[PDB]
């Protein structure tokens, strides 16, 4: 809607601050700069005590270079809002280079960069740099001209605290510790008072909102006139870079270039800078008169597109000097369109041209106006393309510029598929069927980049837990094409073809890109070429993510090879690994605790843990030696899955503890085991059964569970109880004494010997002890005793395989 | 000779087929087109097969090769007859990637007829082509553009490397610095003294990059047979001409070399020689598997070994042996009531730089108008009674790893240490007084106990007494003074002097010896024999001889 502009517009042409702070006075009161603006070579900017909020826009571009004594660029410009980008220096719009005192920008008032890009470089003291989002401040189309480095922030700038302020891409968005960046809602694209309160989209650079509710655009989306915003200018007024201007004032106005002061041309409703094709500025220099148009210019070298600016409008290029586009760029920037502006006029040239040591050139497409080079030397070489690591194609399909003499010289063009060169033949005078070997590198161009080749298909046809095999779906037209269309994979000469080759690797994420040229650093495994289109893999890791691709290895100096895209598949479960760090621990003479884990590749969805514990016979008496000689004082110690733990014949203890447990578990505890008995233990993980297995592998091969291995543990020592009982002593009538008892029912292993002991009630006396290897104790129905006259006390303790049992209590006897 | 067939060698196994062929025949050219995927040993197999040949009848060709650095495998090759590929070319070289060297420098080949072909050889060095000039029979003044793809070869393989002096200033036990004494002009020198190496723009010169590695023999080559190599640790570039290395292995033989890094468009470079150094004798590794065994109550045998890295030269082994506080009575529970058996226990990318380059050029053109006693020295601590050493220390030569020690306290546990140490190196003696030290390694303890004595200090002054001679009999003796550890009980014993009587025994703490130094019993009338033993913290002792008394 037609509506008011914020503040009166006081435009002023481009000005330059140079060598003195005093020159800032020249920038007085300007609401806008109708041109470029720069500050440079101000080493002592300390007297900058005055600031200028009145200005809000400058149209073309900004450069700040070699200035010191200045802290933040916001010091001079509080309210600069937008850059209309009508002319772009080196494609960029914002430039700040080599200014040592510059630690900050602080320009939280700018809102839009209409074209080009930004460039802040080698300003060491700069900080809070990456927190600025520049992708938002540029146009929504492809505009990635953000370039920032050379500040030593990893050490010099760790101050990125910011308030708390919005956080995106895992860091805050700021200008400094105070001024946080603000995005208005996605509907806006920087035409807003704040994060949500926005005027009409006509208000570029935000707006002022009157206290009466009236919006006031800071700048107009399309154009301006008399402090108003409108979509188009009134009749009789030409548009000049932000505003409607009369023809006379357009004539008085001027637009500057590196070495020109061109005056404004009021023509076809716009204050044109210079005439288009087929037109020429009249000798009155007040309008563009029609012509033809044709214009001659000198040849030379183009290093940067800034120089390319100088060649605009030249239909012809003369001079024996080989023309050499030698430009380069950080990214695929506006180079294409800027060279379109610079070179779209030329259709004829006197001498040859070379391109070398150039970066970022997508193609020569911008040369579509050309028709013939005419040759000249670069001696006896028509066209030269050397070491351009981004060029891939030359021209439009219909555009073909003749070359009358010389041979081409193409080398180190790793993204230029050679097939494009094969198109160049008819434009050369000799119309040859092939290039001389010293003309174009057969492998030095296009090799590194894909840039072409024919498409191809493949599908996995069967898979095992350890093997797989694949089958190409595309047709293969060996020799004469038997079936046109529907993809062909043509090989005019069957002798040229060799066979398909498959590649594969282990890739959990399935984003390995493709074969790698450099020596080593390769991870794919190649395969032998094959003819049928089907090949088989084996020895694969089960239940693992695999990636693969297919390509025609048969070069045979034939350039029509084909290639497939990457694809992924997973091996079958297979067999689970053994359980890790399994440990069993005794808890009591009838209790055990066992723990484990599965720190390995599951090889299938783990479904359970197979806990098994089997009672093992206790160690038995060995008749090697008579253990009365010295005591063995203490104990020593070191398939179809099925459930159903089991209990003993006497039901005193568990004989088997084969148990089902989920993979949820990592430990278990056990109870009702027999003292001093050994148990063999298993813990085996098991996977699920494949849908195919449960109907094809049902009879055998199971493999649902891992391998079992024996862990051993003993019930500890038995309790103290059941050593000896029924102890008593008597006499045979000089008569022998006799003692009696009954052996323990379930000793700590079989009794090795009885161990009797006795002591007098005499003070200070030490007892005496003896053994019995069970003798014929029960045949005599008691052990036989002969002692000296007196009164005595007795004890006995069990001696078994587990070692010494405890002593039983005492009783006393008298002898006379 | 075998005069094996000429022709196509598309793969390594074909070279393997022609093993031992001193002569190669067949007017068709010998064509070498191995496209192997850089998996090493390509050169090795080529020499295994083709190194025997000394003469080639027909011409030979090489193109489309992958991973090949040179033809150096042609050790025996001497001359090429060049029978036609055509008469124009006896030798043909086209589109050979990674190729950077011709026949051995001291070798000279002869070319019989025609010329050669060299184009699209990015890593091959144009200057090297001239070396073939004397090799051709016709002796041309130079190879013409028709034969040499000069502009198409070596554009990123230049070779005019000026040698660079590089020397350390010093090295620690873990670090070193390198300081290229050769001066390099980054701007155009405007002709000062010498300035043998130069660059046209400081920005084009990235900086010096350092290579270093570990080589006991100091013979590692610059290049590697496998083009992929990582034996050389490589660091970030720098422009000051000085670098500092850290995290190095003390006294380890290293090898290093440096190279200039510059834009690919730039083609001048400089390069240093292969140089080595050693990294100071550092901390020794502590002795390995030390162990000892007691030989007697007074003697012990100690053994050790040194298998780990010396990090220098072992000046001497040092030993320390100490008496720990002797094992003490565990009064927690009673002896006597239970005895003790005296048991015991145990490529570069230039994009960003060039992007800065050209933008800066345009801008500038636009602006301007018109716990251990680390003294570690031999010493001994002698007992007050002088029957034993409570501490012992010794220096020993580094050429034997076992020793025996004696005059220890008869019964006790001992703590001993052994450690190796290095020399007072001249690089360190200048200030090895402000601590620094670190000559000797740390160590680990060894714990052991001596054997029990000849006899358990047989209790002496045994006698039997009786007062008011009725009153009970009394037995007296002097307590032991040198038992195997603290005495814990006295075991008195006696027997009645008649047939088939047992010989009783007792046990008792150290009670009542201060009062009368003797034990008493109300033994019944009769004649008996008396003896006694005692037991210490080292379990049982031994018995005395017999004494006899009649009682009533």
């Amino acid at each position: 809607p037609t509506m008011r502009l914020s503040q009166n517009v006081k435009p002023c042409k481009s000005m330059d601050i140079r060598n003195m702070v005093s020159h800032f006075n020249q920038l007085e009161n300007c609401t806008v700069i109708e041109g470029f603006l720069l500050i440079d070579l101000i080493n002592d900017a300390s007297p900058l005590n005055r600031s200028f909020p009145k200005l809000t826009e400058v149209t073309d571009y900004i450069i700040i270079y070699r200035v010191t004594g200045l802290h933040s660029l916001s010091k001079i410009f509080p309210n600069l809002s937008v850059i209309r980008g009508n002319k772009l220096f080196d494609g960029y719009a914002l430039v700040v280079y080599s200014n040592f005192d510059l630690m900050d920008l602080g320009l939280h008032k700018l809102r839009s960069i209409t074209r080009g890009g930004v460039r802040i470089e080698k300003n060491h003291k700069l900080c809070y740099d990456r927190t600025i989002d520049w992708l938002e401040i540029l146009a929504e189309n492809e505009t990635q001209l953000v370039v920032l480095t050379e500040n030593g922030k990893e050490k010099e700038c760790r101050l990125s605290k910011c308030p708390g302020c919005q956080l995106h891409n895992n860091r805050r968005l700021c200008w400094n510790s105070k001024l946080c960046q603000t995005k208005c809602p996605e509907k806006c694209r920087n035409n807003c008072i704040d994060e949500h309160t926005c005027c009409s989209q006509d208000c570029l650079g935000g707006c002022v909102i009157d206290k009466n509710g009236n919006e006031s655009c800071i700048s107009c989306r399309n154009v301006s006139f008399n402090n108003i915003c409108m979509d188009s200018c009134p009749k009789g007024y030409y548009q000049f870079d932000s505003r409607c201007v009369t023809a006379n004032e357009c004539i008085t106005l001027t637009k500057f270039e590196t070495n020109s002061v061109y005056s404004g041309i009021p023509y076809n409703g716009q204050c044109i800078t210079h005439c288009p094709t087929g037109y020429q500025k009249s000798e009155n220099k007040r309008m563009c008169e029609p012509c033809p148009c044709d214009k001659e210019c000198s040849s030379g070298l183009i290093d940067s597109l800034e120089r390319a600016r100088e060649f605009h409008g030249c239909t012809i290029i003369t001079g024996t000097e080989p023309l050499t586009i030698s430009i380069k760029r950080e990214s695929g920037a506006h180079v294409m369109d800027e060279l379109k502006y610079g070179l779209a006029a030329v259709h004829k040239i006197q001498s040859s041209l070379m391109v070398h040591l150039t970066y970022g050139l997508k193609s020569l497409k911008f040369f579509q106006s050309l028709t013939e080079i005419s040759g000249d030397p670069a001696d006896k070489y028509a066209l030269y393309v050397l070491d351009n690591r981004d060029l891939d194609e030359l021209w439009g399909p219909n555009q073909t510029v003749f070359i009358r003499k010389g041979g081409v010289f193409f080398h180190f063009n790793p993204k230029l598929c050679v097939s494009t060169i094969n198109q160049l033949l008819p434009m050369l005078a000799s119309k040859p069927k092939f290039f001389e070997k010293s003309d174009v590198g057969a492998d030095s161009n296009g090799n590194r980049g894909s840039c072409g080749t024919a498409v191809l298909n493949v599908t996995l046809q069967s898979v095992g837990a350890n093997s797989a095999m694949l089958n190409v779906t595309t047709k293969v037209e060996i020799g004469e094409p038997q079936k046109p269309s529907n993809a062909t994979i043509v090989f005019k000469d069957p002798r040229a073809f060799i066979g398909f080759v498959f590649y594969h690797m282990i890739d959990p994420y399935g984003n390995s890109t493709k074969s790698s040229d450099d020596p080593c650093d390769d991870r794919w495994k190649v395969s032998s070429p094959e003819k049928s289109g089907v090949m088989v893999l084996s020895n694969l890791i089960p239940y693992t993510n695999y990636s693969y691709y297919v390509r025609t290895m048969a070069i045979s100096s034939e350039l029509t090879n084909a290639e497939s895209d990457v694809k992924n598949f997973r091996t079958n479960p297979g067999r689970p690994s053994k359980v890790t760090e399994v440990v069993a621990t005794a808890i009591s003479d009838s209790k055990i605790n066992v723990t484990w884990s599965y720190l390995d590749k599951p090889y299938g969805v783990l479904t359970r843990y197979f806990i098994k514990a089997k009672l093992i016979n206790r160690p038995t008496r060995n008749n090697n030696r008579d253990y009365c000689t010295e005591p063995l004082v203490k104990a020593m110690e070191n398939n179809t899955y099925k459930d159903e733990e089991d209990l003993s014949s006497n039901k005193q203890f568990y004989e088997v503890f084969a148990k089902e447990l989920p993979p949820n578990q990592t430990h278990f505890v056990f109870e009702k085991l027999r003292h001093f008995t050994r148990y063999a233990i298993f813990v085996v993980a098991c996977r699920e059964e494949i849908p195919s297995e449960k109907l094809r592998d049902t009879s055998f091969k199971k493999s649902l569970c891992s391998d079992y291995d024996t862990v051993f543990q003993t019930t500890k020592r038995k309790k103290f109880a059941d050593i000896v009982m029924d102890l008593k002593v008597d006499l045979e009538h000089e008569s022998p004494v006799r003692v009696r008892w009954t052996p323990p029912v379930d000793p700590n292993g079989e009794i090795v010997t009885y161990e009797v002991a006795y002591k007098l009630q005499k003070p200070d006396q030490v007892e005496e002890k003896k053994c019995i290897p069970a003798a014929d104790f029960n045949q005599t129905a008691g052990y036989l005793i002969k002692l000296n006259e007196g009164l005595y006390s007795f004890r006995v303790r069990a001696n078994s395989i587990a070692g010494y049992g405890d002593f039983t209590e005492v009783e006393h006897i008298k002898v006379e | 000779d075998k005069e094996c067939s000429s022709g196509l060698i598309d793969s390594l196994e074909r070279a393997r087929e022609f093993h031992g062929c001193t002569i190669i025949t067949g007017t068709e050219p010998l064509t070498i087109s191995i496209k192997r995927e850089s998996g090493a040993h390509v050169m090795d197999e080529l020499k295994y097969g083709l190194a025997a040949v000394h003469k080639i009848q027909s011409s030979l060709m090489v193109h489309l090769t992958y991973g090949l650095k040179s033809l150096k495998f042609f050790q025996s090759l001497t001359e090429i007859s060049g029978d036609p590929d055509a008469d124009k070319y006896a030798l043909y070289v086209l589109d050979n990637r990674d190729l950077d060297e011709l026949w051995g420098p001291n070798q000279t080949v002869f070319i019989r007829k025609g010329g050669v072909f060299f184009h699209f050889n990015p890593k091959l060095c144009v200057s090297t082509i001239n070396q073939l000039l004397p090799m051709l029979a016709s002796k041309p003044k130079f190879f013409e553009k028709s034969d040499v793809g000069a502009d198409s070869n070596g554009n990123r393989g230049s070779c005019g490397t000026a040698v660079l002096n590089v020397t350390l200033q010093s090295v620690g036990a873990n670090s070193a610095m390198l300081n290229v004494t050769t001066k390099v002009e980054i701007g155009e020198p405007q002709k000062p003294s010498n300035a043998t190496i130069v660059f046209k723009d400081p920005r084009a010169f990235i900086g010096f990059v350092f290579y270093h590695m570990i080589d006991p023999y100091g013979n590692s080559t610059k290049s590697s047979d496998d083009p992929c190599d990582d034996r050389w640790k490589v660091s970030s570039p720098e422009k000051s001409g000085v670098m500092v290395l850290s995290n190095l292995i003390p006294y380890t033989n290293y090898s290093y070399y440096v190279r200039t890094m510059a834009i690919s468009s730039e083609l001048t470079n400089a390069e240093s020689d292969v140089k080595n150094f050693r990294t100071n004798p550092g901390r020794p590794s502590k002795v390995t598997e030390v162990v000892a065994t007691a030989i007697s109550d007074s003697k012990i045998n100690v053994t050790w070994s040194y298998l780990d890295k010396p990090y220098g030269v072992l000046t001497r082994y040092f030993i320390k042996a100490k008496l720990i506080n002797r094992p003490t009575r565990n009064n927690n529970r009673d002896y006597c009531t239970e005895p003790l058996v005296k048991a015991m226990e145990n490529e570069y990318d230039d994009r960003k730089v060039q992007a800065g380059m050209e933008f800066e050029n345009a801008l500038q053109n636009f602006i301007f108008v018109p716990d251990d006693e680390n003294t570690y020295k031999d010493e001994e601590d002698l007992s007050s009674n002088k029957q034993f050493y409570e501490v012992f220390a010794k220096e020993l030569p580094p050429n034997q790893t076992h020793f025996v020690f004696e005059k220890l306290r008869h019964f006790t546990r001992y703590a001993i240490f052994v450690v190796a140490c290095r020399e007072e190196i001249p690089s360190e003696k200048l200030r090895d007084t402000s601590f620094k030290k670190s000559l000797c390694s740390d160590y680990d303890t060894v714990f052991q106990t001596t054997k029990r004595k000849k006899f358990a200090d047989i209790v002496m002054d045994l006698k039997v007494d009786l007062e008011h001679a009725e009153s009970p009999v009394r037995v007296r003796w002097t307590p032991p003074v040198d038992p195997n550890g603290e005495i814990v009980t006295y075991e008195v014993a006696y027997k009645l002097q008649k047939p088939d009587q047992v010989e009783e025994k007792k046990c008792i703490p150290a009670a009542d010896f201060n009062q009368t130094a003797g034990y008493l019993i109300k033994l019944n009338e009769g004649l008996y024999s008396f003896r006694v033993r005692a037991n210490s913290i080292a379990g049982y002792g031994d018995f005395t001889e017999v004494e006899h008394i009649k009682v009533e």
Binding site: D16, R18, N19, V261 | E188, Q190, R203, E360, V369
Partner: peptide, 27 residues
Amino acid sequence: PGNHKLCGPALSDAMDVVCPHGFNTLP
């Protein structure tokens, strides 16, 4: 000094030292 081939930041430094003040301004 004599003949020159300054390039890179060296040219900027040389210009700055050749005169500490005074440039004609681009317009």
